[PDB]
């Protein structure tokens, strides 16, 4: 009978092992034990992204944002979901928001957020070129 924290730690190990559906299931078990912890949802969202399930990832990002409206990772992963779902304007807004929140919170993710922003803007532009 593991604790919520033990379940999160197991999920994290499975994630390192690139066992994403297994990791996601572990985070689900953690959520069962304590559904008020934003990180369980953002971790699972990342798993769903790796599993090419942006719809499921998006719902987890929404759950995380309800718990912590300032979550950098929830905004970032939400943007990634929207990008995959070809909602480019929303994606860019969320990645920009992630960038702004990371700055406000004095968090350092190197060039990860700007790089994702560039990818999103490039994808947006390319979608326009694909239509003319």
């Amino acid at each position: 009978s593991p604790s919520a924290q033990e379940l999160k730690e197991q999920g994290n190990r499975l994630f390192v092992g690139r066992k994403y559906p297994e990791a996601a299931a572990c985070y689900g078990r953690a959520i069962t034990r304590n559904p008020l912890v934003a990180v369980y949802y953002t971790n699972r969202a990342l798993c769903y992204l790796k599993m090419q399930q942006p719809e499921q990832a998006l719902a987890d990002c929404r759950r995380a944002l309800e718990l912590d409206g300032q979550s950098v990772k929830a905004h970032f992963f939400l943007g990634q979901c929207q990008l995959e779902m070809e909602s480019y304007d929303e994606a860019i807004a969320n990645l920009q928001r992630a960038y702004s929140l990371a700055k406000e919170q004095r968090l350092n993710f190197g060039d990860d957020i700007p790089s994702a922003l560039r990818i999103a803007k490039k994808k947006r532009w390319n979608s326009i070129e694909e239509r003319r």
């Binding site: 999920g11 994290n12 994630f15 990791a23 990180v39 953002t42 971790n43 990342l46 950098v72 990772k73 970032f76 993710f109 190197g110 990860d112 957020i113």
Partner: peptide, 6 residues
């Protein structure tokens, strides 16, 4: 990175 679990 940012794409990492916590």
């Amino acid at each position: 990175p940012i794409s990492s679990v916590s």
